[PDB]
Amino acid sequence: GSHSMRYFSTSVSRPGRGEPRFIAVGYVDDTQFVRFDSDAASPRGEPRAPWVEQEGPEYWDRETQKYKRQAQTDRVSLRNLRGYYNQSEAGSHTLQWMFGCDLGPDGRLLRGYDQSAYDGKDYIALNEDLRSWTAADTAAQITQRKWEAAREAEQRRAYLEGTCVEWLRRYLENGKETLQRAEHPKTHVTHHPVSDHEATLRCWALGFYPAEITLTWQWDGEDQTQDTELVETRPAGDGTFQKWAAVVVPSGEEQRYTCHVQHEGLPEPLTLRWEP
């Protein structure tokens, strides 16, 4: 029942090589649906999922207008931040902004979030109540004071608790065939000899959606963590995700090891073994 609509915006300055570049992307859950890039050949909000391709040209023009507006706003913010930190005019800087609204497990609005980072470090965030701000340093307190005087939080909260949720629900319905159906992982275990006394077992999960998954190795039914390697969950490029977990084992003890897979698309946790 839980779902989210999340946006990720990045502006990057490049002094002496033109004005900053702005990129924004939007997702429902782990599915991207929109992008905008101010450096694109013709900057416009563009669909990246089929379930927004029928929204119509009015909708898309309005999104494009907002992206161009935020790109503009980020350019002013970057200039302000350089001043707050007394930074030189020559260096390049990054401003990142993530926000979203989340439905809880019963499909009702649970919470929103709104956070910003400058040069990869926390800058200012809306607190969980969506009525107050946490500033990371004295520079961000300048922003907090302006936004307090402007009642900026009330405007963010109105979007996160209203418009954001209404449009998330519209997207969830229009894309229900894919967005509201988990895809279970397809699994297998591979084996590699390392030496005359060691081997590797690799437990695979492919083709799953959403991205959240847990892979664990056990020896005689006991969780094994000391000698297990876990890669970062990665996109397949088709909307699904992949992950593996490898454990090194004594040669000849492979049958003692089992891989355990947890995923929303599995009715119960799955146990796997190497089948030579």
């Binding site: 907002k66 935020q70 706003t73 913010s77 800058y123 200012i124 936004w147 954001c164």
Partner: peptide, 8 residues
């Protein structure tokens, strides 16, 4: 649906 906000 995107949202655009105040300058920092």
């Amino acid at each position: 649906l995107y949202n655009t906000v105040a300058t920092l």
